[PDB]
Design a protein around this nucleic acid. Structure first.
Ligand code: ADP
Lengths: 529, 1238
DNA sequence: TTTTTTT
């Protein structure tokens, strides 16, 4: 019945691939099944009650444990997707379950396993009958509400419902330079159509309605009201996760007690995974920075709670992991080390009263109000503030400078920003730590940079480079109120990082709040650097 | 047939050989086309050159014509003997064809078939670059080209500005003396052509779409006043294009910063949107026409931030003659340099940049080098064979020449501090001193060689062994490839001479090894560890193998000093980090071992017993997945072979094949055995054959592969991986390799506690009885060599350094009350912050050889050649914002594959190095993703490249069939044949019916390879001469790896490297904006590294392992598995010694007592946990679960796994790897009950 | 049942 295909590292199972995603294996592609078909008793539980109290609060009081990914027939169950494939030699297009395709496999060397077209005789049927290699189709249909399905070739090639049952062909449209032109040809009705008609606004006239399929759960919904979309195979906008995390502290919001513990005059040292040092402060940054704390033993846990398909999460758009309300959710833990930086209160309170800061805050609030009303949400809520944007920009610049100077890998370092000001206990600080247990600098390589002779270097070299962007004139002139954007003066070329590291997902960013740019000057926080 | 007049309008001599340049537009020269003969005369009417046209390029005022066949007329021939007229107004003119045909043999004595062809490869490497550049950037046809049947957006890949990225700019610094500058901008524009003016049809008669190109551009003049730059439009016909920027205030030096931009401001129309785009832009800045001095551009500001470093200041000192003048914002820059190297005259932007790197050599062959090196080369003073026969006084006379000229060079370099090092006098003196130090050590080495006689004997022995191995390796290689040669051919002076820095390193390393009482090895402070650095390709490996040979030879002549044996045992330990690297190093070391054995065997026959009776051997110590761990497995592999103990494929001494099932013998093993490997010579003339070596103590090839056979009879040399050294805390029989032995068995060898044999045997199978004998111990080894030292950093280098505490301790021995320590030699390609690294891992003082000098180009041993005299390796950059990576990769691969065929069809076999193409990839997932695109889309686009109506000028038709993927999935049997698969060239014969070269393949022949792909390392086994073209996917994670990887191509032929850089990644874009400066100053940019042991996170993992490793091997009571539970008060006093040595090294390395207190507390904690468990009664306490007593035995330590990490978990490898999870497929058929609907 | 590459 079952057969192995391949293997991956288990750190990916909560960030890339996982339930409902398309795994691009070297020979084919699969979709991971839901967690209700997983081996419950081969998943080692992980103990963290503080994260459990929030997971229960979001997904209901029936959740029991947080469990690790499992470890000859033991593994992660998958199922092939998409089901329509194309033969290379003859160009024939047929679904797998019609019988014309058969599988060649080895149960001891399962990396070589791939599909072949059984008894190929060529396009004209003159070649000898031999198995020939085949390639999966390169187009899919996506829905906003969460549904995924194969491309409807039969509906598209005949312009509607049809009677014909003949074979289909694929072509490269003759010319070499063209990737935009592709042809689908019917062998029996002799009709043809182009793949260019399914994109742009032309897709609304031609493409049919959504069906409501969940490939990982193997179910069909009754009805769907969303307009479908044509999407390439392996696109970046196909799967986004929903994650929640917390830190292990000695002993109701998650971030509250962490800020309480980290700002104590004497940090505790009795817990086995908590040890801190108090190494100085650079001489150029005396008035701004009040305390730098280096952490040499730190522990973090994570969780996976759901996913969405086309757009990033802001909850009607979340897709469940099981048919019922699930009893357990996956988990992951990493032992690492971090650096904490605290800023001066009075310098921030004085800087908030300048006029240009109020102008930029009004512009960003207008852009936020424009952005929330386009999706029928309440526009009078969820503004983090202007201090959040300032700290969030400084964090991204520092993380980029870490990779530019020391030669680190990009996805090795995560971030965490403390900026609440509404509960009478104002917060100001960022936290930078390692992402995985096998990344760069895990053996004391990050606490090395926490000395006063290196952190000031890093900050100066970060602030000097950010003065001119590579698309500078139109970048500084960008107005978030006109186009309902949630960012200003921060494009891909000067601010943003990989999707693993960011906490909010590349929102609320403004480099003019830090240093004087070409159009805002008086709104800066660091002067003369 | 056209006429022309020579004027020499170009400077590049290689191009002026093969090209002709004519002024004016090509519209005045439209009648000249391809395949037309031309004739060139000078300004006085003398016939000079004849050529055949290959290709025509054109510009706004000049045209460039290329050739493929050319002949030069040497004689002074007047035009007046020919009936042809003088060329009027220096223009073209038609020549009579029949008169030309009659005149060619009559006066020039040549015919059409007598014209030769161009053979240079630097011309081909330029033609290929032009062919790719025309397709990727444009314009393909010319200034007024036409584009048929396709949109103009997708025809080109790079260099286009969209209407409302849309802008480009650059930054530069200007002098404060001038006040006006000049700015020039140019671009291109395309316009739709109406139907009634063009007659291009489809196949069915319909009209096609045709666009036409029109040039633009204009100049402005700009005064410098502080403030923003006023908007200006260079061209009146397009008033919505802008140049803008800002001008800043003065600095402390008195210069100004100027920032520029070029912005497209056009609007988007509803139809024909491609008319609003701007194509092929560029900017040029120059001084004004009436200005006094042209050079006004100066150095970009340093931007100091209060930091000092002697190495950084020295690096700024050496690279002072290459200056960065500008930076780019989205486009690379290029600057022209005046007669003063600090001043620049023009700056301009370049969409795709190119730069060529100078090559490094060892001097002695050219006429312009120093007289002493040429005298040494010409007089044969570098010959290895000659140096072993001279007397002591001619030997010192020959060796003094290497030091006298070095002292003269040091004296010459001292005068230039005041003149040519202004601003850097202190660093100049600091660099001057170390050359005098090196000269002092060279004279010390010569003095040591003068007084001692054992050193002289060892020196002669090493010279002879190196010469013999050097000569015989080439004969073995030639014999393995089926060549019919004899040994007489390879005995020449050319193949048996030194290179000067190898001999200098040998003379450096002599005094520390000849006498153990030297101050280098007997005191803990100021001990030198010799770091050797050089460009890749110089003989570093042959340099330290000679040191290993000298170390081996001298040890047997010193006698048994200090109550230790010296006639046998391990001497040299060599270690690596890559398992494959050890496999190619072993094959190199075996030839030297064989040569030493052959010398020793001949020495004993004559009656000279100085070398001893024990033979020289060599072993491999790598993981059990490669080598058998027990002789039963060695028997089982051979038994399964006839119906792995063989790492050798061919005999190192004669090159004969090896049959695994016949040439391997395993002796029967009641308790232990020996494995032998014999040469495959059936006729029986090799010295390692079965008919000759049966009498020797170690018959056959002297190699040891099995772990137990190594443990019972230790070898002279060991080649191992670093990760195998972590197994000391698991197995206690490793102590034999460090010389902790007391007993020996006549039948089997050295013994350890817990072994099978006890030394007492009765008579059995006719063999006599024997009894256990006692023996004095053996001296620990002398020399440790660590290669690829730059890879020893980060998390790997931390655990290499932490586990080096025990290794540095266990080779110590006492001589006359002092403590003797081993010499450490390291080798690397780069150097950056080496002092802290070497002090951290090795705890030594560093010494770098050779020193810098006052220049990058010139020191005494390395000479950097000029582009005029020797070619270099050209780099080229490609980048496009917003484009997907596969869309770039397909276009690049197709362009290169198709242009290579076009160069093949006209030239022939010299196009071979660019014919196969090598690709480097950063990740396995991207390699697998590209593998499917290479089979399907690249082949399709390569097969359809000249059967559409779109004109592609320089590409040609090729078929792509053979793709290989060189990675970790290949068995080692075909890997030498895969390397020999790449040796076959593209066979081609001239087809006279078509007039071109075509590859015809015979019946069942071996086809060549078209595309080969590579993972993070290349195959790096041999220096195959064929490969000369390479493409890199993205910038690698380190600078040293980048210099290493792209240096593997173009070693015997001109090379070409092309880097595809993304736009989203920070490092790729940052390297794109500074492409020209980064590739001119390589060593300035090596990224920082750190080695931090005794940090808490390393102490939770490695501390218990290092403590147990030190405790087990040094004592006898704790050696075996039953050693646990013997910890009691009478034996507790020997653990404090190990705790104290760990704490002493921690305190010395960290140089901070705050680390030492923590280390002491953590060691005391582990000691008191050990003391609790050993005192538990009613059980047998052991290290592991093993033996018949396992039903009552409880283990003490654990292996890493599913459980949580604790104090007693001991790792089994240096690097931590997280185990993966597998996927299970559920193949089944699915029915559908739901239907589509509108 | 132990040794290592690679994101
Ligand atoms: N004494 C010598 N004479 C001539 N060529 C030499 C000599 N020593 C080394 N070589 C050349 O050096 C090459 C090997 O260089 P190698 O020592 O492997 O460089 P690396 O520093 O990377 O180890 C060989 O191809 C060989 O031709």
């Amino acid at each position: 019945n079952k057969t192995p295909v391949g293997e991956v590292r288990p750190s990916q199972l909560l960030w890339t691939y996982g339930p409902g995603a398309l795994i691009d294996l070297p020979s084919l592609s699969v979709v991971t099944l839901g967690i209700d078909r997983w081996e419950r008793e081969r998943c080692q539980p992980i103990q963290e009650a503080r994260l459990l109290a929030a997971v229960r609060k979001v997904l209901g009081p029936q959740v029991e444990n947080l469990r690790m990914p499992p470890f000859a027939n033991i593994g992660v169950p998958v199922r092939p997707f998409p089901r329509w494939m194309r033969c290379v030699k003859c160009g024939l297009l047929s679904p797998f379950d019609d019988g014309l395709l058969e599988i060649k496999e080895d149960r001891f060397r399962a990396e070589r396993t791939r599909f072949v077209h059984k008894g190929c005789t060529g396009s004209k049927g003159n070649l000898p009958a031999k198995d020939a290699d085949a390639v999966p189709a390169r187009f899919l249909l996506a829905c906003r509400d969460g549904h995924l399905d194969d491309f409807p070739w039969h509906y598209f090639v005949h312009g509607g419902n049809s009677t014909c049952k003949g074979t289909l062909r694929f072509f490269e449209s003759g010319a070499s330079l063209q990737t935009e032109n592709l042809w689908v040809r019917c062998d029996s009705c002799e009709a043809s159509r182009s793949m260019a008609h399914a994109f742009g606004k032309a897709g609304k006239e031609n493409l049919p309605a959504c069906r409501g399929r969940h490939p990982h759960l193997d179910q069909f919904d009754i009805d769907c009201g969303e307009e479908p979309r044509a999407v390439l195979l392996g696109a970046t906008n196909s799967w986004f996760p929903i994650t929640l995390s917390a830190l292990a502290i000695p002993q109701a919001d998650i971030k509250g007690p962490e800020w309480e513990v980290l700002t104590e005059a004497n940090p505790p040292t009795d817990y086995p995974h908590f040890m801190s040092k108090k190494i100085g402060t650079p001489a150029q940054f005396i008035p701004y920075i009040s305390r730098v704390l280096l952490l040499e033993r730190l522990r973090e846990v994570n969780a996976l709670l759901g996913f969405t398909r086309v757009e990033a999460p802001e909850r009607p758009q979340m897709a469940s992991l099981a048919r019922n309300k699930p009893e357990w959710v996956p988990a992951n833990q990493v032992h690492g080390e971090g650096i904490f930086i605290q800023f001066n209160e009075k310098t921030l309170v004085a800087w908030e009263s300048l006029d240009a800061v109020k102008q930029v805050d009004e512009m960003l609030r207008g852009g936020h109000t424009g952005w929330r009303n386009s999706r029928n949400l309440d526009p009078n809520e969820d503004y983090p503030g202007i201090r959040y944007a300032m700290l969030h920009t400084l964090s991204h610049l520092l993380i980029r400078e870490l990779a530019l100077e020391c030669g680190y890998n990009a996805a090795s370092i995560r971030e965490r920003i403390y900026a609440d000001t509404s509960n009478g206990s104002p917060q100001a600080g960022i936290l930078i730590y390692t992402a995985a247990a096998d990344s760069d600098g895990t053996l004391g390589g990050l606490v090395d940079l926490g000395k006063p002779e290196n952190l000031g270097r890093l900050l100066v070299q970060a602030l000097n480079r950010s003065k001119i962007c590579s698309s500078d004139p139109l970048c500084s002139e960008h107005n978030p109120e006109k186009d309902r954007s949630l960012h200003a003066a921060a494009c891909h070329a000067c601010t943003l990082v990989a999707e693993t590291s960011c906490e909010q997902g590349n929102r609320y960013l403004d480099r003019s709040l830090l240093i004087p740019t070409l159009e805002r000057i008086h709104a800066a926080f660091f002067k003369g650097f | 047939a056209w006429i022309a007049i020579d004027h020499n309008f170009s400077r590049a001599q290689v191009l002026t050989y093969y090209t002709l340049q004519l002024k004016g537009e090509h519209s005045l020269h439209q009648a000249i086309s391809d395949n037309d003969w031309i004739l060139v005369l000078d300004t006085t009417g003398n016939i000079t050159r004849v050529g055949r046209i290959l290709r025509i390029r054109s510009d706004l005022e000049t045209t460039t014509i290329f050739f493929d066949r050319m002949l030069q007329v040497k004689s002074v021939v007047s035009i007046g003997i020919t009936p042809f007229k003088f060329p009027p107004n220096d223009r073209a003119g038609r020549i009579q064809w029949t008169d030309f045909i009659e005149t060619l043999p009559k006066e020039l004595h040549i015919t059409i078939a007598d014209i030769p062809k161009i053979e240079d490869q630097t011309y081909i490497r330029e033609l290929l670059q032009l062919a790719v550049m025309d397709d990727l950037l444009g314009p393909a046809g010319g200034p007024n080209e036409l584009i048929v049947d396709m949109g103009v957006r997708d025809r080109y890949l790079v260099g286009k500005l969209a209407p409302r990225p849309s802008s480009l700019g650059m930054t530069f610094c200007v002098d404060g003396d001038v006040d006006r500058v000049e700015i020039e901008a140019r671009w291109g524009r395309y316009e739709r052509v109406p139907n009634d003016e063009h007659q291009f049809f489809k196949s069915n008669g319909q009209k096609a779409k045709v666009w036409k190109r029109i040039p633009c551009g204009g100049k402005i003049v700009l005064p410098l006043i502080e403030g923003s730059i006023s908007h200006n439009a260079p061209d009146s016909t397009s008033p919505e294009v802008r140049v803008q920027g800002s001008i800043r205030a003065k600095n402390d030096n008195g210069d100004r910063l100027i920032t520029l931009f070029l912005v497209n401001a056009q609007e988007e129309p509803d139809t024909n949107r491609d008319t609003a785009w701007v194509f092929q832009p560029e900017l040029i800045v120059r001084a004004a026409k009436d200005a006094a001095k042209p050079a006004i551009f100066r150095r970009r500001p340093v931007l100091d931030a209060d930091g000092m470093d002697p190495e950084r200041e020295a690096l700024e000192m050496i690279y002072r003659d290459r200056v960065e003048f500008a930076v780019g914002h989205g486009v690379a820059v290029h600057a022209e340099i005046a007669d003063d190297v600090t001043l620049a005259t023009e700056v301009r932007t370049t969409v795709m940049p190119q730069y060529e790197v100078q090559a490094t050599e060892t001097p002695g062959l050219e006429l312009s080098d120093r007289p002493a090196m040429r005298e040494m080369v010409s007089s044969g003073l570098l010959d290895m064979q000659r140096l072993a026969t001279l007397d002591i006084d001619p030997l010192v006379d020959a060796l003094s020449v290497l030091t006298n000229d070095y002292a003269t060079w040091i004296d010459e370099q001292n005068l230039n501090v005041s003149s040519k090092a202004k601003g850097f006098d202190t660093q100049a003196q600091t660099a001057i001193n170390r050359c005098q130090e090196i000269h002092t050590r060279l004279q010390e080495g010569i003095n040591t060689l003068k007084s001692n006689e054992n050193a002289l004997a060892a020196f002669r022995f090493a010279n002879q062994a190196m010469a013999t191995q050097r000569i015989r390796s080439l004969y073995a290689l030639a014999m393995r490839r089926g060549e019919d040669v004899t040994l007489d051919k390879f005995d020449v002076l050319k193949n048996r001479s030194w290179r000067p820095f190898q001999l200098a390193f040998l003379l450096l390393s002599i005094p520390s090894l000849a006498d153990p009482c030297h101050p280098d090895r007997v005191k803990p402070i100021e001990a030198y560890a010799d770091l050797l650095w050089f460009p890749t390709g110089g003989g570093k490996t042959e340099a330290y193998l000679g040191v290993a040979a000298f170390t081996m030879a001298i040890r047997r002549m010193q006698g048994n000093l200090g109550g230790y044996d010296s006639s046998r045992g391990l001497t040299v330990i060599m270690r690596y980090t890559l398992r494959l690297l050890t496999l190619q190093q072993f094959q190199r070391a075996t030839a030297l071992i064989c040569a030493m054995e052959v010398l020793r065997r001949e020495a004993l026959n004559k009656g000279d017993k100085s070398l001893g009776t024990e033979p020289f051997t060599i072993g491999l110590w790598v993981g059990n997945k490669v080598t058998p761990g027990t002789t039963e497995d060695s028997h089982n592999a051979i038994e399964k072979t006839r119906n792995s103990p063989v790492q050798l494929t061919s005999c190192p001494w004669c090159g004969t094949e090896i049959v695994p099932g016949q040439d391997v013998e395993v002796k029967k093993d009641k308790a232990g055995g020996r494995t032998f490997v014999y040469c495959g010579d059936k006729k029986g003339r090799c010295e390692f054959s079965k008919g000759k070596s049966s009498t020797q103590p170690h018959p056959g090839i002297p190699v040891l592969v099995v772990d137990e056979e190594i443990y019972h009879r230790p070898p002279t040399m060991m080649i191992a991986t670093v990760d195998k050294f972590a197994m000391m805390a698991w197995r206690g029989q490793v102590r034999t390799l460090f010389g902790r032995v007391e007993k020996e068995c006549e039948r089997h060898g050295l013994l350890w506690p817990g072994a099978n044999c006890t030394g007492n045997h009765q008579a059995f199978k006719g063999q006599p009885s024997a009894k256990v004998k006692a023996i004095p111990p053996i001296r620990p080894p002398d020399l440790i060599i660590q290669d690829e030292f730059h890879l020893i950093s980060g998390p790997l280098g931390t655990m290499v350094g932490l586990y080096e505490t025990a290794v540095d301790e266990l080779c110590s021995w006492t001589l006359n009350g002092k403590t003797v320590k081993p010499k450490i030699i390291a080798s690397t390609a780069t150097v950056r912050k080496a002092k802290e690294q070497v002090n951290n891992v090795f705890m030594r003082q560093v010494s770098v050889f050779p020193p810098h000098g006052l220049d990058v180009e010139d020191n005494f041993f390395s000479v950097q050649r000029h582009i005029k005299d020797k070619f270099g390796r050209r780099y080229l950059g490609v980048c496009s914002p917003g484009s997907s990576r596969p869309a770039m990769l397909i276009r690049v691969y197709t362009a290169f594959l198709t242009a290579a065929q076009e160069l093949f069809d006209h030239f022939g076999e010299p196009a071979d190095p660019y014919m196969t193409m090598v690709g480097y990839f950063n990740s396995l997932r991207e390699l697998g993703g590209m593998k499917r695109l290479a089979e399907d889309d690249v082949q399709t686009r390569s097969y359809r490249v000249q059967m559409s109506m779109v004109e592609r000028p320089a590409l040609a038709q090729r078929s792509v069939n053979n793709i290989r993927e060189l990675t970790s999935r290949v068995s080692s049997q075909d890997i030498p044949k895969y390397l020999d698969n790449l040796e076959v060239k593209f066979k081609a014969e001239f087809d006279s019916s078509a007039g071109k070269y075509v590859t015809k393949w015979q019946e069942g022949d071996t086809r060549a390879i078209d595309v080969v792909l590579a993972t993070n390392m290349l195959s790096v086994g041999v220096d195959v001469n064929r490969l000369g073209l390479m493409a890199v996917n993205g910038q690698p994670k380190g600078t040293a790896e980048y210099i290493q990887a792209t240096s593997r191509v173009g070693r015997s032929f001109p090379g070409l490297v092309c880097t595809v850089l993304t736009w989203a990644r920070p490092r790729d874009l940052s390297h794109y904006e500074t492409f020209e400066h980064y590739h001119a100053t390589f060593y300035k940019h090596v990224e920082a590294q750190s080695v931090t042991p005794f940090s808490p996170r390393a102490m939770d993992r490695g501390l218990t392992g290092s403590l147990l490793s030190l405790m087990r091997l040094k004592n006898n009571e704790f050696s075996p598995n039953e050693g646990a539970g013997k910890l009691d008060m009478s034996n507790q006093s020997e653990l404090a010694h190990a705790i104290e040595v760990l704490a002493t090294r921690a305190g010395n390395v960290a140089e901070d007592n705050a680390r030492k207190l923590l280390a002491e507390n953590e060691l005391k904690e582990r000691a008191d946990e050990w003391a609790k468990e050993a005192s538990k009664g009613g059980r047998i306490l052991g290290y592991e679960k093993r033996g018949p007593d396992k039903d009552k035995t409880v283990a003490l330590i654990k292996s890493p796994g599913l459980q949580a990490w604790d104090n007693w978990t001991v790792p089994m490898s240096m690097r931590e790897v997280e185990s993966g999870v597998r996927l299970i497929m559920d193949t089944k058929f699915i029915k559908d009950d739901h239907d589509w609907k509108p």
